[PDB]
C-alpha cells in the first residue's frame, strides 16, 4: 500500500505526564484521535515519529525480534480493529497499517494510547528536552523533564562502598530471554582497598527471581572510566566510548562463579570508577527478573573500616 | 551496611 499521512489527521493529542524519574520506572503516555479525511485502502499506512528524547519500548529490548516492537491493534470508535501497528526501534517510528476494515467505510475514526519512555542513550543526563512528536506529518510539541535518581550512591564516607546498576534491556518477546545491565562500580571514585563486587541473579531469595547468573548464562565486560563526570545518569554506557578503557582481559582469572546465581569479581585496590556491562539470561519460571549488586571493601590504608553497599534492580511492563 | 535501588520499565 501507499503512505497516507496527508489523508490522516490527529487531534485531542495528550501527554499523561511531562516530568518523571526513568530510574524509578517513570514513564508517560501519548493518546490521540485520528480521522481519515479521504478514502484509503487496506494496506495503506500512516506513521508517528518519536523525537530524540523518547522511545516507545524503554527497557524492553527487541533486538532479537528484528528490531521491531509489536503493538496492540488500533481500534475504531466502534471497537473493531482499523489498523495493525508496529514500532521500529532504529527509526523510532510507529507504522499503522489499515486493515480490510477501511474498504467499505468513509469518515473512519480511531484513537490510540501508547506508553512512552526515555531514550537512555540520547537523554543520558537529568534535565529538560524537546519532546516534539510527529503524527501523520503534523507536530505536537512538548517539553520533557527527566529527574534521574543519581547513579552516584553509596555509604556516606570517603572510603565507603559504592555501587549502582540498572537493567536497561529485557528481551521478553523472542524466547531467548536475555537482559542487558549496566553496573557502575565505585561511581564516587573513592580510593578503596580489597574491593569485591557480587552480581546476583536474585535479591534475598533465589526462588523469587527468574535471573540466571553463571559462566554459561552471563558475559561481562569491564571498563576503566577516565573522566567520571562524563558518565550518564540514565545508566547508558557506550563500550566504544573513548572515555572507557576496556580491561576485561585483565579480569580473566578474577571473576568467579563460586556461588549459585552469583558472579564474584575481585577488583582489589582501586582508585578509578568502572563500568561493568552485563549480558545475561533469565529463566522460564515466569518470575520477575530481580537483581542485586553488592560492593564491599576496606580502607586501603588501615585495612580497617570495612564497608558494604547493595543495589536492587527490577523492571515494570506498560500497555497501550 | 546500607543500600538502595532503581527500577526501569518498557512495553
UniProtKB/Swiss-Prot annotation, chain A:
Superkingdom per UniProt: Bacteria
Compartments reported by the entry: Secreted, Cell wall
Post-translational modification: Proteolytically cleaved by aureolysin (aur). This cleavage leads to the inactivation of ClfB.
Chain positions covered by the region annotation Ligand binding A region: 1-320
Motif (MIDAS-like motif) on chain: 61-65
Function field: Cell surface-associated protein implicated in virulence by promoting bacterial attachment to both alpha- and beta-chains of human fibrinogen and inducing the formation of bacterial clumps.
Domain comment as written in the entry: The Asp/Ser-rich domain functions as a stalk to allow the ligand binding domain to be displayed in a functional form on the cell surface.
Family affiliation: Belongs to the serine-aspartate repeat-containing protein (SDr) family.
UniProt-recorded name of the protein: Clumping factor B
Organismal lineage: Bacteria, Bacillati, Bacillota, Bacilli, Bacillales
Residues shown, of full length: 212 to 531 of 877
UniProtKB/Swiss-Prot annotation, chain B:
Induction pattern: Repressed in keratinocytes by all-trans retinoic acid (ATRA), via reduction of mRNA stability.
Protein name: Keratin, type I cytoskeletal 10
Subcellular location: Secreted, Extracellular space; Cell surface; Cytoplasm
Disease: Epidermolytic hyperkeratosis 2A: An autosomal dominant form of epidermolytic hyperkeratosis, a skin disorder characterized by widespread blistering and an ichthyotic erythroderma at birth that persist into adulthood. Histologically there is a diffuse epidermolytic degeneration in the lower spinous layer of the epidermis. Within a few weeks from birth, erythroderma and blister formation diminish and hyperkeratoses develop. EHK2 inheritance is autosomal dominant or autosomal recessive. Epidermolytic hyperkeratosis 2B, autosomal recessive: An autosomal recessive form of epidermolytic hyperkeratosis, a skin disorder characterized by widespread blistering and an ichthyotic erythroderma at birth that persist into adulthood. Histologically there is a diffuse epidermolytic degeneration in the lower spinous layer of the epidermis. Within a few weeks from birth, erythroderma and blister formation diminish and hyperkeratoses develop.
Top-level taxonomic group: Eukaryota
Subunit structure of this chain's protein: Heterotetramer of two type I and two type II keratins. Heterodimer with KRT1. Two heterodimers of KRT1 and KRT10 form a heterotetramer. The KRT10 subunit in the heterotetramer is probably disulfide-linked. Interacts with PLEC isoform 1C, when in a heterodimer with KRT1.
Leftover remarks: There are two types of cytoskeletal and microfibrillar keratin: I (acidic; 40-55 kDa) and II (neutral to basic; 56-70 kDa).
Tissue expression: Seen in all suprabasal cell layers including stratum corneum. Expressed on the surface of lung cell lines. Localized on the surface of desquamated nasal epithelial cells (at protein level).
UniProt function note: Plays a role in the establishment of the epidermal barrier on plantar skin. Involved in the maintenance of cell layer development and keratin filament bundles in suprabasal cells of the epithelium. (Microbial infection) Acts as a mediator of S.aureus adherence to desquamated nasal epithelial cells via clfB, and hence may play a role in nasal colonization.
Sequence similarity: Belongs to the intermediate filament family.
Amino acid at each position: 500500500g501507499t503512505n497516507v499521512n496527508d489523508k490522516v489527521t490527529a487531534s485531542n493529542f495528550k501527554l499523561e505526564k511531562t516530568t518523571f524519574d526513568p530510574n524509578q520506572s517513570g514513564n508517560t503516555f501519548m493518546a490521540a484521535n485520528f480521522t481519515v479525511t479521504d478514502k484509503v485502502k487496506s494496506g495503506d499506512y500512516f506513521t508517528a515519529k518519536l523525537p530524540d528524547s523518547l522511545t516507545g519500548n524503554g527497557d524492553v529490548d527487541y533486538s532479537n525480534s528484528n528490531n521491531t516492537m509489536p503493538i496492540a491493534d488500533i481500534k475504531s470508535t466502534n471497537g473493531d480493529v482499523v489498523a495493525k501497528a508496529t514500532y521500529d526501534i532504529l527509526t523510532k517510528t510507529y507504522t499503522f497499517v489499515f486493515t480490510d476494515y477501511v474498504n467499505n467505510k468513509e469518515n473512519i475514526n480511531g484513537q490510540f494510547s501508547l506508553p512512552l519512555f526515555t531514550d537512555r542513550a540520547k537523554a543520558p543526563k537529568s534535565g529538560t528536552y524537546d519532546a516534539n512528536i510527529n503524527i501523520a506529518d503534523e507536530m505536537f510539541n512538548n517539553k520533557i523533564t527527566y529527574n534521574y535518581s543519581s547513579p552516584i550512591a553509596g555509604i556516606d564516607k570517603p572510603n565507603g562502598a559504592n555501587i549502582s546498576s540498572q537493567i536497561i534491556g529485557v528481551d521478553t518477546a523472542s524466547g531467548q530471554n536475555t537482559y542487558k545491565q549496566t553496573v557502575f562500580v565505585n561511581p564516587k571514585q573513592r580510593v578503596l582497598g580489597n574491593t569485591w563486587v557480587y552480581i546476583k541473579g536474585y535479591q534475598d531469595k533465589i526462588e523469587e527471581s527468574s535471573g540466571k547468573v553463571s559462566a554459561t548464562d552471563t558475559k561481562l565486560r569491564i571498563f576503566e572510566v577516565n573522566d567520571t563526570s562524563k558518565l550518564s545518569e540514565s545508566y547508558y554506557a557506550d563500550p566504544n566510548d573513548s572515555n572507557l578503557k576496556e580491561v576485561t582481559d585483565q579480569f580473566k582469572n578474577r571473576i568467579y562463579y563460586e556461588h549459585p546465581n552469583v558472579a564474584s569479581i575481585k577488583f582489589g585496590d582501586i582508585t578509578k570508577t568502572y563500568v561493568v556491562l552485563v549480558e545475561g539470561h533469565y529463566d522460564n519460571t515466569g518470575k520477575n527478573l530481580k537483581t542485586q549488586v553488592i560492593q564491599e571493601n576496606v580502607d586501603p590504608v588501615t585495612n580497617r573500616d570495612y564497608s558494604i553497599f547493595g543495589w536492587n534492580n527490577e523492571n515494570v511492563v506498560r500497555y497501550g | 551496611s546500607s543500600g538502595g535501588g532503581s527500577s526501569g520499565g518498557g512495553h
